[PDB]
């Protein structure tokens, strides 16, 4: 045995009487002393002892001892002596079925907690033991065992589905299935619960007994007990995902069952049922099985979307479940509408019609939500009703009730495509006017709704906002003074999305006047390692890009923090690479946006960036990122390099030696964006190095020729590849020119399709130079070059004379009669263009 010091046990029983004192400040100082005793080891032996052995005590006092012990298992189990432990473990299991339900709960919570903290392979007597106890003839022992087993399957499902314990599932699962039949409804619900853990993992023991499982489920269809029903519903939802086949046969039966449950009095059951419709809808067989029932279903869902009376109360002054019947029904409706398209409206529209206009607001509100939910897939079918509705909704933006104001903002944003595709004055103007008001609404929910809807609307509207710009910024900037936290974040989105939507139009001193100060104000106060510098980078990145050169005043502090972060990150990635156990791996998304913002300033400020580049190790850092193993990073640096190259090649040329070989290796089209931006940045440095490029040409060229001839490459890599070749041959024709016959054809084919611009120009100068040097590359495929030259509408004159000399050079080589015959295989527009423009 173990005996406790009776003189010291009367002591503990006092503490336990004081922990139950009403007086707040007694409780305060008594608990700090019970914390104190943890320091010493035997103490926990006194607790399990008060619980399980001292029947001369108050039950609340006993249960409290076990709960205190329990909490000492959560903190401080590494500090448990293995004798205290083993006394506890054994002492729990002898009383797992105590006659007192309060004690039995307490004992049970200990067991599951010890099993959870001090893992299962360290208590391997337990499962075996708990199984054998299910069979117990004593009911309370059975229930106890099963309650524990249940929490264990919940906590430890992956470990049980593992050799760690020698596949103990193979015995228990079939064992559990037996207990679906049991007298008690509690034992029935435990059994189903345990089993449901192992459905989605496709646990072997269960997949092989699937038919027992299903027959057994089906046999509980008609159970009065919510907790049983809840668990049946969970079971059927999961099955649906993994083992569609086995229950397809019985679908209609199942479906009628779920439809009942979806309406169940008890909202737990309801919600669990509702999940069905949602996960059913993602199943390619769905569309047929269900159609018969849409009639009955739609209104069950729609009726589920009203706020309850209690929902409403918690929303006056998030304060409510992030998942509930309302969201679930509503989400189901969105998926349905994307499957059934307009086939859905006959089942909905009439409901809408009387909900939207209904006089009680809760109902009108759910009307609006529905209308929002169906928007995406019922769009076409809704067009005819919108001229009535969109104006109706613009009205409700000023409704007395905020929950009507906010959902209205949302629903309007779902029809933003249509609104923007009309006369701006009928629908868009008054919409945008009311939104802008609501952005400054007194209520936080309405702000978030309104600001988000605005940002959404802005994306669809694009350049149509330029009239209202003045009015928009007034509102957005003023909102900085109101908004905090979650709504502030939506606001940066709103401003970012604005800049992206109008671009340069936003460059005007009066606009930059009001906008920039409060942003750079916010830029500083929020701290590196803050939740919110991520949305603010992306805000400034958008703005900076739209503002162009007008950004300049403001970019020192933005540059510095960007460089800082790129470094700070690589600092950590290093450590983590060498000592991964002690060092937190970094979050690269921080770096990727910084590089993208820096790349944004390089295009934007152009040359004026230069001096900040000089003062910083931006180039070393870039060097490091180009070898980074995540492709998004390599891609964001090559992008940056090409920009820096144009903006200020003088600070770059130093590092070229080192870069070109890295660029060389990254010309691999498996990762397209990197290959693209690498191809691009060698193009751009060609032009700045000119002739001095020639040492480096051997290390890239065969791979570029590789890529352009290599099929199923996206349009705009080839375009960049062609371009870049041209730009090499422009500055080192001697080395590039001999390769001409291999790339001339896909090169022409690819660039005959792009707009007369500066890249086209610089690349075609290239081809012309190489043709002068190896005039026999083109003679095989000369019609391809004719075609590409005829793609120019209005070329620079020098370039026009270059083509002119080539075209006639050839017509003279082959003679008039050969030429005429050659050009008869030209399409009219081309033949005539060349004959008129280059005189040929």
């Amino acid at each position: 045995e173990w005996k406790p010091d009776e003189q010291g046990l009367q002591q503990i029983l006092q503490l336990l009487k004081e922990s139950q004192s009403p007086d707040t400040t007694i409780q305060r100082t008594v608990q700090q002393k019970l914390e104190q005793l943890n320091q010493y080891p035997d103490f926990n032996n006194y607790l399990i002892f008060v619980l399980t052995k001292l029947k001369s005590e108050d039950e609340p006092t006993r249960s409290l001892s076990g709960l205190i012990l329990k909490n000492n298992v959560k903190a401080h189990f590494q500090n448990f002596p293995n004798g205290v432990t083993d006394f506890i473990k054994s002492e729990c299991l002898n009383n797992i079925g105590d006659s007192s339900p309060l004690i039995r709960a307490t004992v049970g919570i200990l067991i599951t907690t010890i099993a959870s903290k001090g893992e299962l392979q360290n208590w391997p007597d337990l499962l075996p033991k708990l199984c054998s106890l299910l069979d117990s003839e004593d009911y309370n022992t059975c229930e106890g065992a099963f309650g524990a087993l249940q929490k264990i399957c919940e906590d430890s499902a992956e470990i049980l589905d593992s050799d760690v314990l020698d596949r103990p599932l193979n015995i228990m699962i079939p064992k559990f299935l037996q207990f679906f039949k049991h007298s008690s409804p509690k034992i029935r619900s435990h059994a189903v619960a345990c089993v449901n853990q192992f459905i989605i993992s496709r646990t072997q023991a269960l997949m092989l007994h699937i038919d027992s499982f299903i027959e057994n489920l089906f046999a509980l269809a008609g159970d009065e007990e919510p907790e049983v029903r809840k668990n049946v519903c969970r079971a059927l939802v999961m099955l649906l995902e993994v083992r569609m086949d086995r229950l397809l046969p019985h679908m209609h039966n199942i479906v009628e069952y779920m439809l009942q449950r979806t309406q169940d009095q008890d909202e737990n059951v309801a919600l669990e049922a509702c999940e069905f419709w949602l996960t059913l809808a993602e199943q390619p067989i769905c569309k047929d099985v269900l159609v018969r029932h849409l009639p009955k279903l739609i209104p069950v869902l729609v009726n589920g979307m009203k706020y309850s009376d209690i929902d409403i109360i918690l929303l006056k002054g998030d304060t409510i479940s992030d998942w509930n019947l309302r969201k679930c029904s509503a989400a189901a409706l969105d998926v349905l509408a994307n499957v059934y398209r307009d086939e859905l409206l006959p089942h909905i529209l009439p409901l809408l019609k009387e909900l939207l206009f209904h006089h009680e607001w809760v109902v009108k509100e759910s009307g609006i939500l529905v209308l929002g939910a169906i928007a995406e897939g019922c769009m076409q079918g809704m067009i005819p009703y919108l001229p009535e509705l969109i104006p109706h909704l613009i009205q409700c933006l000023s409704d007395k009730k905020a929950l009507v104001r906010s959902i209205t903002c949302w629903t309007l944003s779902r029809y933003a495509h249509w609104v923007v595709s009309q006369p701006p004055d009928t629908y868009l103007k008054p919409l945008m006017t009311e939104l802008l008001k609501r952005i400054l609404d007194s209520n936080k929910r309405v702000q978030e709704a309104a600001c988000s809807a605005f940002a959404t609307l802005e994306e669809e509207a694009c350049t149509e906002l330029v009239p209202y710009l003045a009015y928009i910024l007034d509102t957005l900037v003023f909102a900085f003074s109101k908004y905090q936290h979650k709504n502030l974040l939506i606001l940066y989105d709103a401003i970012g999305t604005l800049a992206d939507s109008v671009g340069h139009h936003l460059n005007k001193p009066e606009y930059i006047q009001m906008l920039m100060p409060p942003l750079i104000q916010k830029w500083n106060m929020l701290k590196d390692e803050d939740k919110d510098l991520f949305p603010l980078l992306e805000c400034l990145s958008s703005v900076a890009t739209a503002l162009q050169s007008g950004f300049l005043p403001y970019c020192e502090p933005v540059y510095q923090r960007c460089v800082n972060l790129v470094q700070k990150t690589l600092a950590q990635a290093m450590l983590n690479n060498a000592q991964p156990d002690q060092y937190e791996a970094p979050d690269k998304d921080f770096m990727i946006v910084a590089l993208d913002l820096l790349s944004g300033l390089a295009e934007g400020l152009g040359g004026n960036i230069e001096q900040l580049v000089a003062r910083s190790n931006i180039l070393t850092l870039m060097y490091q990122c180009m070898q980074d193993k995540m492709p998004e990073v390599r891609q964001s640096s090559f992008a940056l390099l090409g920009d820096l190259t144009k903006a200020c090649f003088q600070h770059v040329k130093p590092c070229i030696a080192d870069f070109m070989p890295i660029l060389g290796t990254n010309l691999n089209p498996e990762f397209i964006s990197v290959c693209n931006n690498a191809t691009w940045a060698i193009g751009e440095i060609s032009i700045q190095m000119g002739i001095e490029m020639q040492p480096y040409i051997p290390m890239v060229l065969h791979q570029l020729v590789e890529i352009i001839n290599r099929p199923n490459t996206p349009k705009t890599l080839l375009e960049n590849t062609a371009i870049t070749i041209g730009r090499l041959g422009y500055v080192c024709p001697q080395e590039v020119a001999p390769m001409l016959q291999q790339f001339i054809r896909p090169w022409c084919t690819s660039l005959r399709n792009i707009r007369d611009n500066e890249e086209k120009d610089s690349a075609f100068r290239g081809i012309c130079t190489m043709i002068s040097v190896n005039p026999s590359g083109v003679i095989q495929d000369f019609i391809f070059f004719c075609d590409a030259v005829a793609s120019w509408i209005n070329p620079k004159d020098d370039l026009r004379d270059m083509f002119c000399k080539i075209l006639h050079g050839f017509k003279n080589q082959v003679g008039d009669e050969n030429w005429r015959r050659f050009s008869d295989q030209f399409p009219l527009p081309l033949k005539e263009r060349l004959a008129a423009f280059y005189g040929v």
């Binding site: 969201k327 969105d334 929002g372 949302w410 940002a455 939506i490």
Partner: peptide, 7 residues
Amino acid sequence: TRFNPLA
């Protein structure tokens, strides 16, 4: 990260 009553 905008308002969405379906998620």
